[PDB]
Design a protein around this ligand. Structure first.
Ligand SMILES: Nc1ncnc2c1ncn2[C@@H]1O[C@H](COP(=O)(O)OP(=O)(O)O)[C@@H](O)[C@H]1O
Ligand SMILES: Nc1ncnc2c1ncn2[C@@H]1O[C@H](COP(=O)(O)OP(=O)(O)O)[C@@H](O)[C@H]1O
Ligand SMILES: Nc1ncnc2c1ncn2[C@@H]1O[C@H](COP(=O)(O)OP(=O)(O)O)[C@@H](O)[C@H]1O
Ligand SMILES: [Mg+2]
Ligand SMILES: [Mg+2]
Lengths: 315, 470, 51, 578, 193, 158, 193
């Protein structure tokens, strides 16, 4: 397909830049921004009109100029290439490998924002999970298809609890007789603003357990650009939904420090001067969080299941 | 010389002038209407189209047909001379005592250049203010910035006048006697009323303290940009004297709360978005450019010392004005309302007061060698006394032990004699004598903080000497 | 009994009241500066119709 | 390059027209005086530039010239023994040509441009060169400085200058493509220098103060925070870390603070002596000093300059310790700058991205494998000053989320002259569980098991504090009097340390281990004697108690014989008593 | 339209002791049940759907979980109607708009539910209307007003929130229909502060 | 509050035999102004005035909860205009009841916020003091005339 | 204009025990009495008008009720001036601007009252000036600044409010008039937070 470029930049300030004659850019498209030094930056269209279009940049705007910068379209809807060979890989949070292996060959391309599940098409989650912790198993039991966050503190060991839960979770079919064998969980791990110390602990625990051969890791370290923190959980949930509802896997999703996701959203909301909320957070945080949480559950007529254990720290 | 007549907009304190691209930013201008009256003004914006002038005084009588604007000077400058000693100024350099204007040796920009951090040296000498609670327990050091925190009805002005009248250096206590040093006091008043102005005028002249002082006095009804300009001119004169004539100067800033309010009003007039609690976001830097002009310089004999005074709005130490001042200054002296209501003057509270440069000014070779331990012992004893006095009201006097009764009497004697000095002038030796006489009422060996050498040398004097003049 | 009551009951409620009042005042201040930020932009947009 | 003229002046904000082609966040020269500023917003033919120093006296029409590069430091030989402000301007050479003040628009160079160095080439023509390798060595004090290529430079060596005396300006290596490599290069302060791989924090960073490296250790390449009030040791503990730690090069970064507080550290530091060589401590440290009245941009960008210099010294294979003093002032400067940009505030007036900046500053620490194959590490210790001791401030909350150690100070122990005055029930460390394999191999097998004994012994008195203020200590039962007395001697011999003493200012790890072993021996034998119904008064009078106090002041070489003799005496004392 | 409105004089039986005894609500009145997260608003509303003596029950899931809507679809076709032998689902109308569904459609669901409840009132039935959460409707109004660049009153809410809420709760009551029959609508709405 | 207001309107009378003015009593005329009132309160007020027989002397201005909001701007002004006319032209003793001033304040705030006026405390318009003053200050007694106007507003404290 | 300001040394007697004994005010001084509604601000000022020893009393009603001025007009002609024996109203000048009167006239009333008080100062009399509420002047300034579309400070007040308040209070004091006599003006101003 042929490419098209727009060179009519008129205004740059902070994360936003204005393109004048961009009439045929779809709302929500992904563009590639190139400067005179050859560096390439990503961006997303957030407002399109007759007079101009508004593009926010996925990272810092140092080096851009109005004379030599050009904006080129990539795709109308942000999509991710999914495949069955992604098990056992590592990605940087915007879809690029970090492990140094060649990139995967996509089977399908799916939108990262997903689609809402039809409430008629759902079914009740019913299979009990034995995690091995008495305070959880007896009094707060976990069911396949549940979203159950951990309300951590500033210096409390929530990461160890999450690793122990992922290490010991089993379904115990003998208590019900509705199956056999020892069908294991696949694990999707998404980290937002994590530091090296906790990343090292997670990596060594996953390699010691041996479950790294059936896991997909999306890693966005704390020194990475802040706008990439928004996109990271959406692709992880896209992969989890694809695996569970197209290959009958039972996946488990772990989201680490979504407080970082909330501050990342607040930074953009303050930059876009939209109406705030209770403590400076944007007024639409409930909807954005719902678009992440409500992608779990089970579906009638299908064998797969999605389970989420988010981790957040109470300020 | 040139005059601009293209006025296109007048509203409140601002007016716009057309084709004024030759006016520098921040310059001072003169505004003349049809009746010949002259008002001042300052340029706050310069552009290709128009310039914005903020007007001193009310804008009554101005019109777009007869108004003209002429330049005075590009940068606000002050003419300085040694003859300024004994003179009173209105806050922008204009004399108000009726004497002829001084002839300037130099004309310096009122905004000061920062001092090079490698050019400073550590403060090492003290100033005798004549007040026992300040001299003995919260000592002021040459080069220190020691603010005074006061309430609303508390006598901050009388304390300021007393300090300006009584402060002096003591070269006879230092080393081999040192050598006579010149001394001067720079006084800055901002937002004062007529009553305070008259009080200061009588006080500085009835006792001869005017002959060594320079007064910058700004009234409450004066234009508020002059209130911004006043402390910078005071510090400019102080820096000139100290670092070009080896003077030891002391700068008193009468009320920083009025300065902060004036800064807020000016910031609101130029359409700035306020910060915390309506105050400008750059108040920290603006206050740093005033406070950090004091200090002592390597290779020079002079020194600049500041005593800012500020009134806490609602006795709220978390208010922005006390909070930002605490990040830049070395301790504070707090006036107590409870001591003020009981008839004690000056009502300086020793418990929440602190001087952070005490350790480098007191000691052997610059004062008496028993200063530090005596101050520590006095603080520790008064802290016990003020709590034993509270316990008495519940458990009665009989239930206490003997030494608790000694502490209870010590607190009362301390408040009666040490703090309540009145209008007397006390040297450091007299204050130390009174301090050792007060400690004498405690039994020997209860004084844990003081070493045996000083206890054997000074303990045992009766309090009847100060009882002849309480 | 009085010491334990004052330590365990009276102080934490007072401190929670302090925190709640502080949060309410800060949130009101934020709402109030938002309006000024809008009004300055409206002023800037007004005097640009035909320069 | 791009030049323009001033169109509008309004405070520090300057609008320059004719600036088509300038780039965001470039450094410009504003006015004829030569003021500097950053471009923060582009719009058509104009460019919004914010000046650092004041703009009084400027007129419309004065030229504006952009340098074409963002804020950057000069990295090369000659940075040791130097004093710089927030934007790497040497204060000593500014004094020589200006006086006691700092005039606006002064132009000086960060690196001396006229000093001869002893160049020694380690390459020959035809060699392949990639980013991060070594061209040669230059001696500098007690260090052999290595001349590295920039990370972005690769090619093939064409000509090499022979050994001799050269300045930093003289090109020493020229490549086949015409690129000239000098003794120095520039790097932006807000972009992290690349590495090959970041390793694990499996080695401890030794402080030399007993309580820190015993109870709350920090690993090499870790991050720590130390909050507290005035007169609480914040300053002394940092300058003791500077002298006694195992770091090769020390970087002290002082954000905008009081002038006399800056004068203290500027005066006392040349007096200090390096323990390893006996020479001045100034020979291995770089100082960044800023007062409260200097421009806010320098104060905000102070810590980035320091961390970039620390990264540059890391890239040569050294171990660097970075000390950020009073990051609350840096947060205040950031708040002021964000207020000048009319951003919407959050919490206590702070910009919404405060946590992102604090994270982006702290993550540059860590132990890495450099591009040249050598190993290096940067360790960061950052001081925090709460306004009234409240831990609910946004700065401390954001710092708590990222640091691996938290050494809380308190003035209650400083009132008793107990130094170091850290609170041992408020502090915590997260590197304990990862340092254990190193601990049980290098120190002793029982050390991780022995530390829990000290922790539990200190804990058990915190459960006895509800009875001691009611009933006097002497009225306690002997089974509790024993706990009180052994915990007391722990507090007065192991936790306390004299930083001014000749031998107490530095304690190796085996010395502390012997002290804990000996204290446990005392406690166990005393409990065994108490089980036989004896009075505890005779235990308090035992001669071994003074042997406990004297263990601090023994020399490092002299310790083992003293430890063995104390072990013999304490074994003889308790089962000689019936 | 109606002919006249009457005074409520018969109880609306919920099956809960504390609500039916200590704090009764009449046939044709309104009630609100605020509470934090985990208090039990949804269990209380589903119990009212299951056990109340209303002829027709309308449930409006305005901006809440989708699993709660599947629980109703699964459990109800098996349970028994309290006042007739048929299945419980034969008397229930569900309007579902979950949280991740489009925001602007939250406003329309409330009006659709109240219009259906009013329609069943005109036939002579007694109708119970349960709104799952009105704070989500308030948030939808806030987002639309943010897009309109209106000036917020408090907490970002538009200044006309109290008019819309008043217009919604007014429609309840016991009336004489245009056909001369008798009907009533009672509204129970949850709030999520 | 509504029950107390109804009881006051039911029981209020002067005591000429104590004050000695001599004039024999006649009942008050009631002017009733409801802004955003619900049916539940309106039916109670209607039934109370029916049972006490005061509907033959009363003028009612009703603005129900489902009626448009901006109509609440006008209702108190016309109610007080009628009260002033009756009292100061036909010598009636008029008692005025206003059901909810809070609903009037919300209706004023809506117009104030639509006009981008500078707000006061809690988002209310800055000129609310003058607007409320123009309503309350229309009561009182006039020299040389027999009539009088008495106001009993009712408002809900948030 | 005046010839020379003087130092206040003569008390201003009001008849209140606590104010005359514990918190005295001199002949040319200024005072303020703030408080919430119902605290007693107006009754204190009317008692000061009734019983003080000033020669001429000027009362400025900036924005209060109208009955408060009807009471003065009805009562004062019947009382007796303490220091001359005649009616009390012969020494009093009233400037009235009630709440429902136009807003812009609130600013002018204060200046008219203070100018009349200064005029009676020049004849050798001692005048007491009382403002019933100085907060309503600030409210009028805010109302006008709202129409002028200029940016306010803190609570919506215009930035120049403090200068106006300072310039109003500094007109008081004991002076030597241009004719050689001695006069004095004392100002008491109520504040309504
Ligand atoms: N380990 C120590 N040994 C001896 N003295 C100490 C120690 N720690 C703190 N002090 C004392 O505390 C005082 C204050 O120093 P410090 O608290 O480090 O600086 P700051 O008060 O600026 O935080 C010093 O005078 C020093 O004597
Ligand atoms: N009447 C009740 N009996 C038993 N459990 C209840 C009852 N009401 C609420 N709960 C408990 O509350 C939990 C969730 O309440 P929920 O309806 O989700 O409140 P909300 O919807 O307001 O969050 C359920 O797990 C349930 O166990
Ligand atoms: N000195 C006093 N003696 C007796 N009653 C007083 C006194 N001062 C105030 N009051 C009472 O307090 C009330 C305060 O009313 P007023 O001062 O007119 O209102 P405001 O203070 O709100 O302007 C009066 O109704 C009066 O009855
Ligand atoms: Mg619910
Ligand atoms: Mg009143």
């Amino acid at each position: 397909l042929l490419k098209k470029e727009y060179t009519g930049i008129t205004y740059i300030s902070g994360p936003l830049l204005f393109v004048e004659n961009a009439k045929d850019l779809a709302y929500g498209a992904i563009v590639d921004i190139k400067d005179g030094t050859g560096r390439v930056r990503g961006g997303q269209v957030i407002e399109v009109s007759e007079e101009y279009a508004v593009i926010q940049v996925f990272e810092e705007t140092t080096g851009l100029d109005l004379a030599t910068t050009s904006v080129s379209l990539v795709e109308d809807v942000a999509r991710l290439g999914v495949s069955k060979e992604m098990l056992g890989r590592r990605f940087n949070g915007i879809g690029k490998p970090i492990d140094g292996l060649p990139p995967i060959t996509p089977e399908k391309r799916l939108p990262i924002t997903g689609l809402p599940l039809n409430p008629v098409a759902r079914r009740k989650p019913e299979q009990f999970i034995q995690t091995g912790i008495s305070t959880i198993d007896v009094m707060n039991t976990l069911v396949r298809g549940q979203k159950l966050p951990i309300f951590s503190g500033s210096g409390l060991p929530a990461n160890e609890i999450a690793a122990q839960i992922a290490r010991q979770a089993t379904v115990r079919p003998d208590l019900s007789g509705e199956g056999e064998k020892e069908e294991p969980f696949a694990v999707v791990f998404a980290a937002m603003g994590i530091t090296q110390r906790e990343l090292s602990y997670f990596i060594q625990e996953f390699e010691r357990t041996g479950a790294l051969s059936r896991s997909v890791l999306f890693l966005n370290k704390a020194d990475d650009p802040t706008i990439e923190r928004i996109l990271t959980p959406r692709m992880a949930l896209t992969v989890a939904e694809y695996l569970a509802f197209e290959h009958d896997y039972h996946v488990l999703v772990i989201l680490t420090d979504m407080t970082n996701y909330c501050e990342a959203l607040r930074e953009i909301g303050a930059a876009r001067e939209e109406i705030p909320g209770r403590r400076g957070y944007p007024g639409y945080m409930y909807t954005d969080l719902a678009t992440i949480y409500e992608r779990a559950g089970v579906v009638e007529g299908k064998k797969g299941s999605v389970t989420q254990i988010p981790i957040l720290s109470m300020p | 010389k040139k005059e601009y007549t293209g006025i296109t907009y007048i509203s409140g304190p601002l007016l716009f002038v057309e084709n004024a691209k030759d006016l520098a930013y921040g310059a001072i201008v003169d505004i003349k209407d049809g009746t010949g009256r002259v008002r001042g003004g300052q340029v706050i914006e310069v552009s290709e189209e128009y310039a914005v002038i903020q007007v001193f005084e009310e804008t009554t009588g101005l019109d777009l047909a007869t108004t003209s604007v002429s330049l005075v000077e590009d940068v606000a400058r002050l003419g300085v001379s040694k003859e300024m000693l004994g003179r009173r100024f209105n806050g922008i350099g204009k004399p108000i005592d009726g004497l002829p204007p001084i002839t300037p040796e130099k004309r310096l920009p009122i905004t000061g250049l920062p001092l090079n951090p490698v050019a400073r040296r550590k403060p090492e000498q003290f100033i005798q203010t004549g007040i026992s609670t300040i001299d003995v327990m919260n000592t002021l050091v040459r080069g220190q910035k020691l603010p005074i925190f006061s309430g609303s009805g508390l006598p901050a002005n009388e304390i300021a006048a007393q300090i300006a009248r009584q402060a002096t250096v003591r070269p006879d206590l230092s080393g081999e006697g040192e050598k006579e040093e010149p001394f001067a006091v720079v006084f800055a008043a901002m937002g004062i009323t007529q009553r305070e102005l008259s009080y200061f005028i009588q006080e500085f002249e009835r006792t001869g303290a005017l002959s060594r002082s320079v007064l910058f006095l700004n009234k409450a009804d004066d234009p508020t940009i002059e209130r911004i300009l006043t402390p910078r001119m005071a510090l400019t004169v102080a820096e000139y004297l100290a670092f070009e004539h080896d003077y030891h100067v002391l700068v008193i800033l009468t009320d920083m709360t009025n300065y902060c309010e004036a800064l807020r009003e000016i910031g609101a007039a130029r359409e700035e978005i306020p910060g915390r609690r309506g105050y400008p976001g750059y108040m920290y830097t603006d206050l740093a450019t005033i406070y950090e002009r004091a200090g002592v310089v390597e290779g020079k004999k002079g020194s600049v010392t500041q005593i800012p005074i500020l009134s806490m709005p609602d006795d709220d130490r978390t208010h922005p004005i006390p909070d930002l001042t605490g990040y830049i200054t070395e301790g504070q002296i707090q006036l107590s309302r409870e001591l003020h209501r009981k008839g004690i003057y000056p009502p300086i509270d020793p418990l929440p007061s602190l001087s952070r440069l005490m350790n480098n000014g007191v000691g052997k070779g610059k004062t008496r060698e028993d200063h530090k331990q005596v101050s520590d012992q006095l603080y520790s004893a008064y802290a016990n006394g003020v709590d034993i006095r509270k316990l008495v009201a519940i458990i009665g006097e009989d239930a206490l032990t003997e030494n608790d009764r000694r502490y209870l009497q010590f607190a009362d004697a301390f408040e009666r004699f040490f703090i309540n000095q009145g209008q007397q002038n006390r040297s450091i030796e007299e204050s130390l004598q009174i301090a050792w006489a007060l400690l004498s009422m405690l039994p020997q060996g209860e004084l844990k903080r003081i070493s045996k050498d000083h206890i054997g040398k000074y303990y045992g004097q009766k309090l009847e000497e100060i009882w002849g003049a309480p | 009994r009085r010491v334990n009551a004052l330590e365990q009951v009276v102080i934490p409620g007072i401190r929670a009241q302090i925190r709640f009042i502080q949060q309410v005042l800060e949130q009101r201040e934020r709402e109030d500066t938002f309006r000024l930020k809008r009004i300055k932009g409206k002023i800037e947009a007004r005097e640009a119709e035909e320069e | 390059m791009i030049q323009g003229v001033i169109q509008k002046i309004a405070g520090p904000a300057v609008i320059a027209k004719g600036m088509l082609g300038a780039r965001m966040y470039d450094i410009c020269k504003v006015g004829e005086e030569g003021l500097v500023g950053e471009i923060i917003r582009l719009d058509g033919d104009t460019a919004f530039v914010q000046v650092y120093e004041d703009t009084s006296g400027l007129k419309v029409g004065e030229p504006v010239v952009s340098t074409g590069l963002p804020l950057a430091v000069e990295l090369g030989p000659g940075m040791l023994n130097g004093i710089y402000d927030g934007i790497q301007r040497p204060l000593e050479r500014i004094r020589e040509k200006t006086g006691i003040y700092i005039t606006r628009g002064v132009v000086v160079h960060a690196l001396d441009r006229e000093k001869k160095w002893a160049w020694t080439p380690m390459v020959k023509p035809g060699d392949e060169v990639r980013g991060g390798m070594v061209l040669g060595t230059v001696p500098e004090f007690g260090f052999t400085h290595k001349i590295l290529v920039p990370p972005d430079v690769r090619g093939r060596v064409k000509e090499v200058k022979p050994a001799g005396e050269y300045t930093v300006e003289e090109p020493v290596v020229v490549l086949e493509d015409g690129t000239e490599l000098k003794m120095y290069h520039t790097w932006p302060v807000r972009r992290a220098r690349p590495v090959q791989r970041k390793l694990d924090p499996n080695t401890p960073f030794l402080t030399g103060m007993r309580i820190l490296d015993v109870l709350f250790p920090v690993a090499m390449g870790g991050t720590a925070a130390i909050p507290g009030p005035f007169g609480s040791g914040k300053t002394v503990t940092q300058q003791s870390l500077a002298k006694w730690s195992n770091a090769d090069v020390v970087v002290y970064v002082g954000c905008g603070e009081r002038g006399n507080e800056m004068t203290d550290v500027l005066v006392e530091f040349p007096e200090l002596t390096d323990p390893k060589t006996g020479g001045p401590l100034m020979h291995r440290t770089v100082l960044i000093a800023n007062t409260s009245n200097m421009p806010v941009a320098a104060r905000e960008a102070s810590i980035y300059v320091g961390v970039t210099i620390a990264e540059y010294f890391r890239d040569q294979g050294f171990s660097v310790a970075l000390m950020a003093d009073s990051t609350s002032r840096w947060a205040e400067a950031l708040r002021e700058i964000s207020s000048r940009l009319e951003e919407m505030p959050a919490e206590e007036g702070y910009p919404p991205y405060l946590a992102a900046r604090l994270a982006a500053f702290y993550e540059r620490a860590g132990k890495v494998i450099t591009l040249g194959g050598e190993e290096g590490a940067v360790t960061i210790v950052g001081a925090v000053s709460p306004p009234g001791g409240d831990m609910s401030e946004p700065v401390t909350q954001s710092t708590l989320r990222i640091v691996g150690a938290f050494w809380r100070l308190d003035a209650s122990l400083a009132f008793r002259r107990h130094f170091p005055a850290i609170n041992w029930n408020g502090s915590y460390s997260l590197f304990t569980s990862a340092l254990d394999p190193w601990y049980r191999e290098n120190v002793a097998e029982d050390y991780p098991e022995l530390r829990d004994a000290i922790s539990e012994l200190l804990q058990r008195e915190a459960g006895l504090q509800e009875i001691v203020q009611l009933v006097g200590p002497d009225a306690l039962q002997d089974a509790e009097r024993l706990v009180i007395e052994v915990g007391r001697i722990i507090r007065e011999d192991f936790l306390q340390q004299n930083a001014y003493h000749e031998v107490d200012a530095y304690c190796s790890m085996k010395k502390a281990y012997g002290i804990m072993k000996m204290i446990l021996a005392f406690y166990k034998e005393a409990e065994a004697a108490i089980k036989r119904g004896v009075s505890i008064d005779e235990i308090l009078q035992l001669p071994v108690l003074e042997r406990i106090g004297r263990a601090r002041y023994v020399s490092e070489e002299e310790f083992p014989a003293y430890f063995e003799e104390a072990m013999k005496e304490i074994q003889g004392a308790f089962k000689a008593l019936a």
